[PDB]
3C-like proteinase (Severe acute respiratory syndrome coronavirus 2), 612 residues
Amino acid sequence: SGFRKMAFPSGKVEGCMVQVTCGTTTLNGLWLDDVVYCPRHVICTSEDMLNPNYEDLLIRKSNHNFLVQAGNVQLRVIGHSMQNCVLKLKVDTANPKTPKYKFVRIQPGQTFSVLACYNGSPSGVYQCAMRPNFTIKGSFLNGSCGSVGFNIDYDCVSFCYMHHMELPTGVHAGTDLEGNFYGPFVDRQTAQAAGTDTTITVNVLAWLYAAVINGDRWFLNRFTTTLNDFNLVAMKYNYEPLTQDHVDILGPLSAQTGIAVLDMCASLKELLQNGMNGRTILGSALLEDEFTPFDVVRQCSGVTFQ
Amino acid sequence: SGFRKMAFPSGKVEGCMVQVTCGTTTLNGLWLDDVVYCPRHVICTSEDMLNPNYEDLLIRKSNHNFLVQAGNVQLRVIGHSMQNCVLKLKVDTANPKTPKYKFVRIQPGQTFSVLACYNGSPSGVYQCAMRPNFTIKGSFLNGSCGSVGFNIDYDCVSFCYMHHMELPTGVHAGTDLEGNFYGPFVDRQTAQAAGTDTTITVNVLAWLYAAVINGDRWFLNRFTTTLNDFNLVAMKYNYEPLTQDHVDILGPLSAQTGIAVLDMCASLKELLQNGMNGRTILGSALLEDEFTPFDVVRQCSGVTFQ
Ligand SMILES: *[C@H](O)[C@H](C[C@@H]1CCNC1=O)NC(=O)[C@H](Cc1ccccc1)NC(=O)[C@@H](NC(=O)OCc1ccccc1)C(C)C
Ligand SMILES: *[C@H](O)[C@H](C[C@@H]1CCNC1=O)NC(=O)[C@H](Cc1ccccc1)NC(=O)[C@@H](NC(=O)OCc1ccccc1)C(C)C
């Protein structure tokens, strides 16, 4: 029993974290096979960042201008290219610790773990969600760029996020591992707007199910509601619209708890309309939306990986 | 910027997780050098658990009754002993992945990461605190026993916790790695009381400092207070008494933020007396006490490990 924001074991990802230096700037890179991936703004000076022309800047660089250090040992860069907002450094030595991996572009509302890194060394690991507005609420200081987000499926690492920048919000933006940004963001130090975030309704319901599985049932109410009546309430509270695909995804939790999804929405509706009255659910005084139905199921069935 | 409940990278600990079977029961073990550690209740049948005599039960066992599996590969058990509530299995092969380690018995209020395991395979990793009443608020299902808590200092793993049992509370109890329980608990399936928990005042203040470092300053008030006046307020709210040793520990955060510790207590006092009024601090609608001053400092300076 118990329910915790839990991240995947980071060991498989730790072994791929390298330090990338080009000019004065140093950031983290991902070493898979004989390719090291990192944000292309590593080739930027502080003044370049205000308005960079990445083609022109990169043309000034050659292979030897890229310092790639894996702990103590050294990659010889024998090829470099820019794919979207990522730099790909071809090295002469495949990482002997390369795990089974795939590059995945996740959907808003999905979750993944972040292995925060500085100078190519892991600092810490934490879960979060791709917000509906394609930002993440992370913990990132200077030199954290190139730190990656990932999920594990038994033995395969799915890389889904590479960190590039912090917005004027304390929120974070970045790319998938083909270097395409999540959201409308560009890698330029210029004012940029995330847009209205919304709460991931299907994650909230899955978390309400997690609560009932762990004895927290006080919010379970006498009522039910309709999919359209609840979506009216949801739009008032900047909750994303619940669909039938979401209902189907909550099916297993529904079957485990013997609580219909629409009975759960009705509890959720009275929580949105009356608040929590100073109560807590799973140790939180707010509605939590960074657990997917899969997150919940996995933590209350005990799926492991290696 | 940003502030997240962050756990240590688990890679070094993943490499020590083995599966231990004795009779029908299977749990996790910690493989360091040529010794595998695990809870002694692995030798218990479900009926033994109600009132076990561990000496008598263990005498019925020999080395070959212990099945230790490291992924696919196999330890030959060549010696077993009971140290307090832990079983020590001598195996013929030292773990080639043994990291620099030490066994540490932590203090209430300190934090550590948990690598939750099932059948010797890591499932997930999360932070928490040893409560003042020597329980942890974890996430543990059946087969999680033997999962360990730890901290890392550069390259040295300090093991501090091994999971043994869940209480009638959904809270968790366990031992250090010499097999001494944290708290008054015994490894017997019999009703057991944790006692009144309290909030870790020094962790709360460190988190308030974390808030100010990240722009959340609304709680900063016009007032100051005295160490004894604040401790009066603290005792009313089941907060642990703030001491000068705690003040000295908060010194660096004090110097970084230019906010005196007692000015912070005065903010804390008005938060305890008037609540948060529906506001949040660092994305929480409750006062958070599972970050030590060290946790805060480390996340806002970027210390790394390997
Ligand atoms: C990489 O190590 C670093 C990590 C940052 C620092 C603190 N938290 C983080 O996530 N990232 C950066 O320094 C990038 C550098 C960059 C260079 C060239 C192109 C793009 C990015 N910059 C930022 O994260 C900065 N954010 C923005 O510039 O975002 C747009 C913006 C918003 C308001 C005003 C101007 C520009 C950040 C403010 C340091
Ligand atoms: C080990 O894999 C397992 C993990 C448990 C299951 C779910 N969450 C957990 O942390 N732990 C156990 O099953 C232990 C087994 C045990 C056997 C012999 C001696 C001690 C423990 N048992 C428990 O965690 C149970 N908790 C208690 O028995 O605690 C005292 C108590 C409280 C109320 C009523 C009777 C006894 C737990 C209730 C399964």
